[PDB]
Amino acid sequence: AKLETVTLGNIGKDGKQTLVLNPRGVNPTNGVASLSQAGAVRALEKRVTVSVSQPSRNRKNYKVQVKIQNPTAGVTRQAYADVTFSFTQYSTDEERAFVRTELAALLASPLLIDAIDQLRPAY
Amino acid sequence: AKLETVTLGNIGKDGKQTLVLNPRGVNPTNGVASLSQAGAVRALEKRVTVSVSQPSRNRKNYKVQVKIQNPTATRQAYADVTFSFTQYSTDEERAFVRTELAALLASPLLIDAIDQLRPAY
RNA sequence: AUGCAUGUCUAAGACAGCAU
Ligand SMILES: [Zn+2]
Ligand SMILES: [Zn+2]
Ligand SMILES: [Zn+2]
Ligand SMILES: [Zn+2]
Ligand SMILES: [Zn+2]
Ligand SMILES: [Zn+2]
């Protein structure tokens, strides 16, 4: 579909934050869609990119790439999260939706809160 | 904390499935925590792995790596997730990326991209 | 040798690439 504004609600450690991501176009060369946070200093905008690659000479499976980049103003630091999905030509949408919704749920588990928010491995 | 059973509910396209992932030990060599579904064959079970890397002399950043592997009775579906944070990152910043990602994965854009393999234009 | 917020696959592994 057409690249539109994404509004992400009840996020943050608290679940009290909203993030409005405005469309910044689809690059015709590589198909990468770009969004970035409304309302901020260009170089400090929280950013998202998404791409979907078909099988080709270069590639046996479908590959979906999701990337987040969040700047903090200074020493300027960046936080990154990068997601790659891999799905064959014979996967079903039930299978792909399972992985998508699995990961979303995983990201709210005590196991992943400790690893990410607290940087604590399980033992 | 001690590697423990993870129960993920209200998942699948329908929002009506639940996955129960059981502890399969932390690797003494590399710190990698394994979990997996119950089942009769180790190769037809849905898997998750988690790892946290500390900064060393060699690398200046923290890194959290999650892998999902879901086989079907035979093709494999994968998700690979890397988080990369500086030593001066705060927990507010890391939790923001975490929960931002989870929400992103429920948006029309990612439903289109992942479920329907349909990019935006 | 190390590193990667690069990619590819039979995926905690292999391989291609970049950087140092
Ligand atoms: Zn279907
Ligand atoms: Zn992968
Ligand atoms: Zn990497
Ligand atoms: Zn890679
Ligand atoms: Zn690997
Ligand atoms: Zn190489």
Q: What b-and-e string marks burial along A63-85, b requiring 16 or more CB atoms within 10 Å of the CB? A: bbbbbbbbbbeeeebebbbbbeb
Instruction: Please give the resolution of this entry in Å, rounded to 1 decimal.
Output: 2.4
| B9/A contact by beta carbon, under 8 A | yes
Elucidation method: X-ray
A61-100 residues near strand C (Cβ < 7 Å): 61, 63, 65, 67, 78, 80, 82, 84, 86, 88
Name the nucleotide with the smallest C1'–CA separation from B58. Answer: C2
Domain locations along chain B = 1-121
Q: If you search the block for the tokens 């990152």, which residue do you land on? A: B89
How many Cα atoms are found within 13 Å in the side-chain-facing hemisphere of A111?
26
> How far does the CA of B77 sit from the C1' of C18, in Å?
28
| B44/A contact by beta carbon, under 8 A | no
DSSP secondary structure letters along A8-23: EEEETTTT-EEEEEEE
| A8/B contact by beta carbon, under 8 A | yes
CATH superfamily of domain region B1-121: MS2 Viral Coat Protein (3.30.380.10)
Burial of B4: CB neighbours in 10 Å, binned 0-12, 13-18, 19+: middle
Q: If you search the block for the tokens 């604590």, which residue do you land on? A: A120
Question: Which residues pair with residue A52 across a beta bridge?
Answer: A64
> How far does the CA of A76 sit from the C1' of C18, in Å?
24
CATH superfamily of domain region A1-123: MS2 Viral Coat Protein (3.30.380.10)
